[PDB]
């Protein structure tokens with residue numbers, strides 16, 4: 001009878017038809033991924049076209065039920081998530097215009113290659129070779145031609161594109177009742193619910209801001225330290241009080257400082273805990289890895305894997321001649337068919353990865369009781385955040401001894417601990433300010449707060465002030481460096497890495513404190529602890545059915561982001577770096 | 592006395608879709624019900640109203656054997672007091688029920704690598720079926736106030752949809768075949784014993 005009752009009914013139709021067609025699309029994509037043939041590409045695209053068609057139509061109709069009239073937030077969440085048209089709310093012709101823009105950018109980035117000046121014949125391509133150069137090279141000038149070469153051939157080229165892009169997207173978000181594009185992306189975190197549990201898209205900037213205020217100390221000290229160690233590699237080039245040259249950070253953007261570990265190892269005599277050889281000696285099998293993971297999850301209280309996950313997946317490269325893509329992923333084919341694809345290899349890395357492709361699978365299984373619209377993590381952070389803490393527990397040497405990859409008598413000492421913690425910090429802490437600053441330049445471009453001309457300037461001003469990096473060659477406004485990043489030029493939001501990174505540690509702290517843990521947070525292993533497991537589940541099952549604030553307060557007792565657990569994980573390294581930089585300058589001079 | 596043809600119902604090659612369930616009446620019959628329980632290849636076998644062992648040497652007056660194919664997940668609704676999508680709009684059993692609910696997985700037969708969208712189920716209906724009612728009307732279901740003359744649009748949906756079984760799906764989403772046995776000591780001449 002009423003609008004809401006009709007709306008229920010509409011949804012029931014939807015969920016049921018959607019679920020089936022999502023099964024078919026995903027099935028089609030799985031045959032492509034695990035069996036790359038022209039025919040299987042054909043079918044994957046056909047099934048995609050059908051899925052897209054269907055979803056667009058159902059969205060048009062879903063708008064016919066006005067959100068105002070629904071009084072059930074668990075229903076309103078589904079509606080509101082289905083209703084937003086996004087690109088379909090723009091008029092038609094600008095849709096094909098934008099699509100040609102975006103497809104053109106992606107093709108540029110993929111085909112982007114910048115010649116070496118010393119031997120132009122041996123020009124080179126980004127993803128195959130240039131990443132390796134940026135990761136291993138030690139020579140300043142060689143590395144430099146790669147940085148500036150990429151940014152010149154590509155950056156320039158994408159300048160025109162990105163701006164029209166900003167215009168079409170800004171307009172589109174405005175069509176959707178979002179004041180600019182960046183607001184549209186901050187929509188994800190918006191969450192209305194029981195009073196006090198709600199979240200306004202604006203509070204995101206304030207909470208990203210204020211958490212980063214807490215993080216900045218640790219970053220500074222990691223920064224001074226790594227600059228100090230770098231000075232010895234690049235004597236002539238590095239100011240002992242200046243920001244660092246951008247190209248010298250191990251990767252083409254300076255997104256992760258992980259590749260600097262070789263150069264910044266604190267105690268190089270004591271090598272890092274690699275159990276690969278141990279695994280190899282016990283003639284372990286990829287299967288064995290996945291079974292060891294499964295036993296982990298069972299030990300914490302979570303269901304053993306489904307016989308479909310133990311009957312269908314690809315867990316090793318096929319090695320019968322059929323091409324596949326190596327990248328590891330955890331699939332949910334909407335019907336009880338969970339699966340993982342992973343070209344596994346016998347290394348500690350894969351052992352730790354597989355624990356968390358399985359942390360996904362186990363999220364998928366947790367929330368599958370929920371209707372098809374609510375079957376996802378409470379927001380963009382929670383999925384990988386949750387499947388990272390698994391690889392955090394599995395890494396601890398306590399665990400590694402537990403399962404017999406580490407001899408029973410093991411020496412775990414300050415020197416190796418710091419070595420480890422520090423590699424962690426290169427990867428985890430590096431990318432907090434990089435990420436936050438990037439998404440703030442994007443946010444502020446979209447709010448029009450950066451006029452066109454001074455894009456690069458404003459950009460680099462922020463990179464000097466927030467990230468403390470150098471911009472080796474001066475870039476004027478003809479240059480376009482942010483588009484050199486995949487996520488930037490392939491239209492992906494990026495604050496997920498900030499939020500996700502801050503979540504994981506709040507989790508691992510809540511569980512550990514609940515697994516009656518004694519000592520450093522960084523040695524915690526939740527294994528054999530069902531109390532922490534049931535507590536994790538109580539949030540795992542909610543999917544998007546409850547506002548992510550509530551999904552969080554269930555686990556960690558607090559309704560928002562909090563860096564305290566992060567700082568608390570890294571406290572051992574913080575003290576050591578502070579003390580290690582008392583005779584050196586801490587901070588960057590923005591010049 | 593000649594044997595019940597339970598065998599020709601249970602081992603039948605093709606099963607009706609739930610919404611048009613297939614009903615067979617059994618009469619003039621001797622049968623061995625302790626054979627069916629002896630088999631135990633049946634995932635589900637919960638005879639209500641009367642213990643399964645007792646009835647083999649008790650004679651009965653009519654027997655109705657209803658068979659259909661339903662989603663594994665849903666077998667729990669084929670029992671008295673259950674309200675689900677199936678029991679609501681497809682095959683309700685009454686409260687005062689005296690009979691059986693035999694069911695088994697049929698994945699190897701009723702599932703296809705690629706899809707077997709042959710079976711169907713009715714998702715909308717103005718009101719709940721009364722016990723044992725059958726309904727096969729394909730009339731467009733109008734939930735709106737605005738009437739739909741044949742055109743399916745907003746607030747006016749088609750009432751049936753396809754199960755679409757696959758060999759890879761999970762148990763709950765796997766095709767279970769089902770046979771419900773009804774007994775009727777209410778008529779004068781009994782005609783089904785053991």
Ligand SMILES: *[C@@H]1O[C@H](CO)[C@@H](O)[C@H](O)[C@H]1NC(C)=O
Pocket residue numbers: 035037038039040322
């Ligand atoms: C791979 O795909 C081809 C057609 O695309 C198909 O004929 C072949 O049987 C498939 N092989 C496997 C192992 O899936």
Ligand SMILES: *[C@@H]1O[C@H](CO)[C@@H](O)[C@H](O)[C@H]1NC(C)=O
Pocket residue numbers: 304305306307
């Ligand atoms: C998981 O363990 C339980 C208890 O032993 C067992 O009943 C169940 O069948 C196992 N899982 C699978 C998929 O076999």
Ligand SMILES: *[C@@H]1O[C@H](CO)[C@@H](O)[C@H](O)[C@H]1NC(C)=O
Pocket residue numbers: 398399402403525527528
């Ligand atoms: C869990 O308990 C088993 C059995 O006592 C033991 O073998 C295993 O090492 C334990 N794991 C941890 C992490 O304590």
Ligand SMILES: *[C@@H]1O[C@H](CO)[C@@H](O)[C@H](O)[C@H]1NC(C)=O
Pocket residue numbers: 597598599601602
């Ligand atoms: C169905 O067929 C199998 C094999 O022929 C047999 O063992 C079983 O008893 C049969 N069931 C009935 C009810 O006849």
